[PDB]
Structures are given as structure tokens and as C-alpha cells.
Amino acid sequence: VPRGSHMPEETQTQDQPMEEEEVETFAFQAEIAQLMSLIINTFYSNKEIFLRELISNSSDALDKIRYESLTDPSKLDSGKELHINLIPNKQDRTLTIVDTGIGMTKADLINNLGTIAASGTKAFMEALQAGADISMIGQFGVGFYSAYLVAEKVTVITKHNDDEQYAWESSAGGSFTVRTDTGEPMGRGTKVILHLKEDQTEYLEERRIKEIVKKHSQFIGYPITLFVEKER
Numbered sequence: 001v002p003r004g005s006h007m008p009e010e011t012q013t014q015d016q017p018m019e020e021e022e023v024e025t026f027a028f029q030a031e032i033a034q035l036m037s038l039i040i041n042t043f044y045s046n047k048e049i050f051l052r053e054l055i056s057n058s059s060d061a062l063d064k065i066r067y068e069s070l071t072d073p074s075k076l077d078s079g080k081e082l083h084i085n086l087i088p089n090k091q092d093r094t095l096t097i098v099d100t101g102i103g104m105t106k107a108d109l110i111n112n113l114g115t116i117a118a119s120g121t122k123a124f125m126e127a128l129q130a131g132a133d134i135s136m137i138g139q140f141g142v143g144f145y146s147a148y149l150v151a152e153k154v155t156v157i158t159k160h161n162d163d164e165q166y167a168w169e170s171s172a173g174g175s176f177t178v179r180t181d182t183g184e185p186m187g188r189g190t191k192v193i194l195h196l197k198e199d200q201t202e203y204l205e206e207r208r209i210k211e212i213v214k215k216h217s218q219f220i221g222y223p224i225t226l227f228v229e230k231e232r
């Protein structure tokens with residue numbers, strides 16, 4: 001019976017029930033798979049333009065918030081700032097691009113990030129064979145896959161007002177997964193987590209990140225902030 005003091009193990013709360021996350025696996029559309037293999041396995045001198053492409057996608061998503069308010073004003077009542085955060089993590093070798101844009105639903109991840117061919121994909125691959133600069137990518141409707149210039153794996157966590165939170169992930173190799181994400185709620189918007197290749201760790205350094213934002217992304221139209229972890 002009587003106790004005056006308990007040890008931590010004794011008062012540890014019972015876990016919450018384990019949750020199921022549904023996972024689905026999809027092949028990339030053929031030309032997207034071919035483009036990813038070309039991007040991954042070819043040397044380019046201008047790999048830094050991946051960040052321009054990801055920032056442009058965030059800016060497009062943030063522009064959609066403003067305009068969706070013309071057909072659904074309730075979004076004006078959100079208190080979230082429309083912004084982009086860049087978050088390098090040296091410990092994990094990741095660079096994360098976070099925005100408070102519209103987010104993507106599950107079917108948006110499946111249809112917009114791998115299973116549908118952009119009409120320009122074949123033309124762009126021929127331009128690259130003919131020696132085009134990789135910087136031309138986004139003009140061909142396939143800018144997202146520039147992430148694989150620097151990343152060995154990409155994870156996209158996203159939440160749109162009309163669906164639950166999802167995670168898309170791919171290490172290339174011809175397929176990607178989409179799985180419900182019952183982890184840390186991120187609130188409306190998208191987080192693209194780049195797991196950087198070992199020779200691409202310059203993109204974790206604050207001066208390099210500032211250099212490429214100022215070179216290539218000066219008309220975002222929204223505040224961008226770079227979080228720098230304090231050196232211990």
C-alpha cells in the first residue's frame with residue numbers, strides 16, 4: 001500500500017494507441033523516370049538551381065492562397081504568415097524548404113509528383129542531350145525533379161485544407177510512395193526535405209544558401225528566412 005515517492009518508470013503514462021498509416025506505391029511515368037535517371041547520373045556545373053525551382057514552387061503555392069480567397073474568403077481569416085523558411089540541418093545532412101502555401105492533397109501528390117507526363121519532358125531530355133544547361137528545366141514543366149541534382153532522397157510532407165497530412169517520398173529508382181502522415185502536424189503548406197548527397201553538403205552552409213537565393217530567387221514576393229543552427 002503506502003508510498004511517499006515513485007520512480008519515473010512507475011508513473012510513465014501508457015502509450016497512446018498505435019496508429020496505422022496507409023502506404024501506396026506508384027511507378028513514375030516512363031519519361032519522368034528517364035528524366036530522373038538523367039538528372040541523377042549526369043554531371044552538371046550549375047546544380048545550385050534546384051533551390052530556385054523549389055522556391056518558385058513555394059511562391060506559386062503562396063500565390064494560390066491569395067487568389068483562392070477570391071472564391072473562398074475564409075482563408076483571409078487564417079493567421080498564418082505567407083512565407084518560406086529554409087532549414088539546413090548539418091547533423092542529418094538535410095535541407096528543408098518549408099512554405100505556408102496551399103499544400104497538396106493525396107491525389108495531388110500522386111498526380112502532380114510523378115504519375116503524369118509533362119508534355120515538354122521529351123523535348124527537355126533532347127535539349128539536355130544536345131548540351132543544354134540544366135537551368136532550363138522549369139521552362140519544360142518538370143522543375144521539381146531538379147531536387148535530385150543534390151538529393152539522394154526527397155520527402156515531401158504536405159497538408160491542404162481539403163485533405164489530411166501526407167508524406168510523398170522517393171529515392172528514384174523508378175517509384176515513389178505516398179503515405180498518410182499521423183506524425184507532427186505541420187499545418188497548411190508543404191515541407192520538401194532534401195537528403196543531400198555526400199558531395200553536395202555545401203547547401204547546408206549559410207553563406208552558400210544566401211549566395212544562391214540572392215543569385216536566382218530575388219522576386220519571391222514573400223518573406224524568406226534562413227534558420228541557422230547555433231554552432232555549439
Ligand SMILES: Nc1ncnc2c1ncn2[C@@H]1O[C@H](COP(=O)(O)OP(=O)(O)O)[C@@H](O)[C@H]1O
Nearest residue numbers: 057058061101103104112141142143144145190
Ligand atoms: N511547395 C509546393 N506546394 C504546393 N504544390 C507543389 C509544391 N511543389 C510542387 N508542387 C506541385 O507539384 C507540381 C509540379 O511542380 P514542378 O515540377 O515544379 O512543375 P510546375 O511548377 O511547372 O507546375 C506543381 O505544379 C504543384 O502542383
Ligand SMILES: [Mg+2]
Nearest residue numbers: 056057143144
Ligand atoms: Mg515548378
Ligand SMILES: [Mg+2]
Nearest residue numbers: 059219220221
Ligand atoms: Mg511570382
